[model samples]
Target: DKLAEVIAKRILDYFKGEKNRVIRVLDPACGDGELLLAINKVAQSMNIQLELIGVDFDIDAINIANERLSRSGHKNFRLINKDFLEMVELEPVDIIIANPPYVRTQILGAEKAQKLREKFNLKDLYQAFLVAMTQQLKSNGIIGVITSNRYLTTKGGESTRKFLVSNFNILEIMDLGDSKFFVLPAIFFGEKKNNVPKFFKIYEQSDSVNSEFNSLIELLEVNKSGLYSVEDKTYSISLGKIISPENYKEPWILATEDEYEWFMKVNQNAYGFIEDFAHVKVGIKTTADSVFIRSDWGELPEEQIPEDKLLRPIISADQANKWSVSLVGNNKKVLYTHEIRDGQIKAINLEEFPRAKNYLESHKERLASRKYVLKANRNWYEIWVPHDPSLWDKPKIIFPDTSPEPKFFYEDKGSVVDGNCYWIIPKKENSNDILFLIMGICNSKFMSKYHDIAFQNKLYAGRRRYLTQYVNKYPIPDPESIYSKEIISLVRELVNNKKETQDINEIENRIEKLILRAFDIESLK
Candidate 1:
């Protein structure tokens, strides 16, 4: 109801000029008619006539909505029991308000899924509805929708982001981060105009409570960037213009003016990006984790255990630290079935490794049951996403896929990285120094600050995403510079020095200062 009230107010405000003319409002996936009723209540106060239309796939919901509307004595309202995506006869609406249903393609029939793919080029049900709603909106129409927050920051939602920016001038975006009962929802208010859009986001803050607001609606009204205390939670509210990248594949970035300035300064001093020196790749994923990844493989009997060559030491979140992979108690290894054959990736020939073949055959039914793996015509026992087998042999920088802060670690043991982590190795051969220099910068406090500002993809408890897109783009200082050399040396010492006798914290402080100097910044804050 809070969401509906907010959307209703904006919609009524948009059509205030129309004295008595019918203002058409639509709820594409309306359930129980709450949204339509909310808009009607607001419209009644403004003495505005409305022709409300509600559509839902469930007949029960439509019946319930019709009863509610009838009890409220709301005339000129129509409720349809049909899927919005399949309904092609609806007229263009002046205003659209929806909390679209979220249906994964897996649940839908093959034909319907194919139709969604061909027509909307979208995977999720809500995405298809979003596209359908955009097409059904009249010129200069307004729409308010509450959808999953993933589209704002996920690489997979790039096309959805592009569609929104291309079709509508976004008015405001309220990232109701982790505040909802389930699924982080973001409310977007937009108008049909291919123009520059304003940006506003409100996310939870773990600290700071200088500013206080009685309610979220009140806080959203004060569209300034600050840490605000509302109810029982502290939120960081950011207001600014949308930073739409030239290529829509890049996720939309949201930051306040001050944050953007800090990001730009960091970017300005960059001698190159991590990608300039290395390729950032995700680790191996065997969809069947239990059958393929384990720590007790060595404990098994000789006949049950896989061949030695087939077992590769692995590094995942369990063994990761800031500057090193703690290989102490982490005896985990992967039944790696991939190898490099003539510079090309190929699944290992199980026939040559009889022990591995015997071990794998023990769980043959379970391993072969992976539907997608067999559908793709891949070997039943092969790791689903085992990256180039050759890259694992080289020294590289590795980090957790998600963390409260950066935990980049240097790895030289050629461990098979697990799916929970990402690794970056130098593109040019013999560039370990560049890797060490990057380790210093990436593991520093300054880079964490830069990350929060530049890429605002954070989860609950302030855990930020360290995906390939953001990590590879991390700035690097000039390698030949004196500051860069000292940082590399310090990082090498930090990694190699087993003697806890030396003050590692103090050394880290020096490296951080050198990094700031390299970036030409006075301080991180």
Candidate 2:
């Protein structure tokens, strides 16, 4: 109803400046003619013959709106029952106003909802309505909409926000906090001219109850960030990978709190720990888990075994966590030599018989020629194995850096040690102190700010999610700096103590600020 008053004032302002004029208005998601009724009342008071068009997907809403307008003696209004998505053929109008439905996607199924979902690549039905409504606006035309604040910050509305930034500048956003709007607490108001509004308000409660709209508006007008101004830019980010239990095949270990702390204390400075000092890579590849097996308990069927397909014993992440290697079933044999089996070189358990035999047979030649490589794919977490230079000296070690490796086979039979997660081999001129420094820096609170923005949902309330991007983007402090040394030493001590230390709040905060200042971002909140 407040929006109706504004629209009426805008119409009156246009006419008062031009003596007599015809004003056109359109409501794309018009519900039961509330806005139209409101607009008619304003137009009647102003003694203006206004042209009003209200379109809605619901037939009942259209009928009720038409009936309401007819009863109000406003015959210039047109109500049409049409799907908004398919109704772009309507005549253009001077003004548009709507309180579009705010329906979240979890309630809407994935299929049969393409039109709504495709609006902003958003899962919310409301955002889609806003995008569609905006698209129907004329150049230089005014638009006013009341939508949920979720569009302002939620992940589902990122694309919609981007669209607004690129096209429609937000005129104003009013936060009517806590009080119920529909089924939930919501904020309702207007956005105009694709331009950021001059004033935005955050009301602790609805304006209807307190009559403090003017005061709230005045406060927002003075404070730039009070509820306006796009100060922070949102970047699209996602988690690295989710390791599946079924696909895991390497013994891995996470640094204990004590170990992490001790390393930090020794190094003092915590940056350049991974890339400059050691390499982090994933494990080997096993084409077929069922076929290649060696265990302490079972015996394999000799006839089905291919000599080249047999592999050495393997270890898995689960086994490493348990501090022991488990045996594969005996009847399931490892392929020792990389040779053709039934024309292709894939390992297969004879007992479980090949399910894709026909398909494999059809591509036998391609399979035989294809090299057995293990590279990380989108699935399973990429193992951060420390590179050991000594492994280069061993000839039997087939360290095909370019090829992808399977996880299961490497753990069960591969020569790679199951030491904790993996060993950290320092680079030339780099000491274990440097390793501690790097780990501390990557795990620091300051670096975590970037990491948090880059992977917000994956992280716990206060913990940072470890990923290669976070490590690579980490800014290193100057090595000659004494403060760096002190910090690193403190971190190393923390790591050495493991689980004994209780709280790291104070230490984490101090180091975080220092790290930020080192990067010349101390001014950044």
Best by TM-score: 1
TM-score for predicted model 2 compared with the true structure? 0.45
Tens-digit per-residue lDDT, 1-525, candidate 1: 356777798766654235678988899989889899999988888888899999998898999999999887778999989988898567888899988886455477888889988897564666777889998888778889888888877887787777887787776676767664348887788887633346667788775465556776676566567788867778777787554443355556665676666777888888999888888888888888898888999777788788888888988885678888667677788889899888789999999898888889888999998899899999888889988887788988889998887889998988888889888888876478888998898888888877765665444347888878778778998999999999999899888876463577889889989998888888765
The weakest ten consecutive residues by lDDT in model 1 span 241-250
Compute the lDDT for candidate 1: 0.80
Candidate 2 off by > 4 Å: 1-26, 32-53, 57-81, 91-96, 102-131, 137-177, 185-436, 449-482, 485-525
Instruction: List the RMSD of every prediction in angstroms.
Output: 8.1, 13.4
**Model 2, position 296: C-alpha lDDT score:** 26
What lDDT tens digits, residue by residue, belong to model 2 across residues 1-525? 344555445434433223256667787878888766776677777776678889888788888887888888777888889867556457766667676664546675666377566644554555566667666665555565556656444555566555554444333344433323342222222233432132233333211122223422223223322222121311111111111111112111122233333333333544444566655444334343333334421333443333332334433343431111234442323333232347653334433433223323443454444343223222111112323323422211111211111111112133443322232234567554655555556555454444333333223333333333334444567655676676677655654443322445456556666665554443333
